[PDB]
């Protein structure tokens, strides 16, 4: 289940 939404994940960190 690899995380593909890098843009959103970066903003959530």
């Amino acid at each position, epitope marked *: 289940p690899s995380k*593909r939404s890098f843009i959103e994940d970066l903003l959530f960190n």
Partner: antibody
Framework: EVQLVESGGGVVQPGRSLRISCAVS????????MHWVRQAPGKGLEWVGV????????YYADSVKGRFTISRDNSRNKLYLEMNNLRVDDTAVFYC???????????????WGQGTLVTVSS | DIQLTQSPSSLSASIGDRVTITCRAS??????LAWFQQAPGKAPKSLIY???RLQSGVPSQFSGSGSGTDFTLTIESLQAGDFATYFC?????????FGPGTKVDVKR
């Protein structure tokens, strides 16, 4: 082919809550952040919010103020939007849209569903 | 949040015209700027992302430029399907936000 399909819209009385849903095909749902967008009749596109691919994180438009909640089920691969305390001007088409993909250089909101219409009326 | 302003709010044009629509952000959004097209009763279509990258399946008379706060959508040679409403949208930071839309109709 990427496909997103919203369901659950219809006529609902003000003050009630309504849960709409989005089902997907053509990609691994659990890999993606997922977004909702709304469009009131004759008005512009308005972002509602997003939930992270694992469900741990969410973010909403400034105007939501806790009144709408996004959820997801990475076993049935469904996205939900629960809209509470509905008022007449909540009437709008609601679109689900996929989050970004860094591997394919796909931006957030590349792929959209066809929308589902929520009509708030007494 | 970040406000996106578009100019003009509406314009009329003819087949074969060069049309330019601008989007201005209230904060620097680097290149994290997209353009959408919407026809009546249809979901919007992603045209442009990363300010200047044309999306797959989109005809290349569309092009985007700009970085930071000022962005332009150029339609180099307007065609029949391009009479539509255009929205810019930023994904530099949460909450994501859209501009108000610019409608392009047929000149007569």
């Amino acid at each position: 082919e990427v496909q997103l399909v919203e369901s659950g819209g219809g006529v609902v009385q003000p003050g009630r809550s309504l849960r709409i849903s989005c089902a997907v095909s053509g990609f691994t749902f659990g890999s993606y952040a997922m977004h909702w967008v709304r469009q009131a009749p004759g008005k512009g596109l308005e972002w509602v919010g997003v939930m992270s691919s694992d469900g741990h994180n969410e973010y909403y438009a400034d105007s939501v103020k806790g009144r709408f909640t996004i959820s997801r089920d990475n076993s049935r691969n469904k996205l939900y939007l629960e809209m509470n305390n509905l008022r007449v001007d909540d009437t709008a088409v609601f679109y689900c849209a996929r989050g970004s993909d860094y591997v394919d250089d796909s931006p957030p909101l590349h792929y959209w569903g066809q929308g589902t219409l929520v009509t708030v009326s007494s | 949040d970040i406000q996106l302003t578009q100019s003009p709010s509406s314009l009329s044009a003819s087949i074969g015209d060069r049309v330019t629509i601008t989007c201005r952000a209230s904060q620097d959004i680097a290149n994290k700027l997209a353009w959408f097209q919407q026809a009546p009763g249809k979901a919007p279509k992603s045209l442009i992302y990363a300010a200047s990258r044309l999306q797959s399946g989109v005809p290349s008379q569309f092009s985007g430029s700009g970085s930071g706060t000022d962005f332009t959508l150029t339609i180099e040679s307007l065609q029949a399907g391009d009479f539509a409403t255009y929205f810019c949208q930023q994904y530099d930071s949460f909450p994501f936000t859209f501009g108000p839309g610019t409608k392009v109709d047929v000149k007569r």
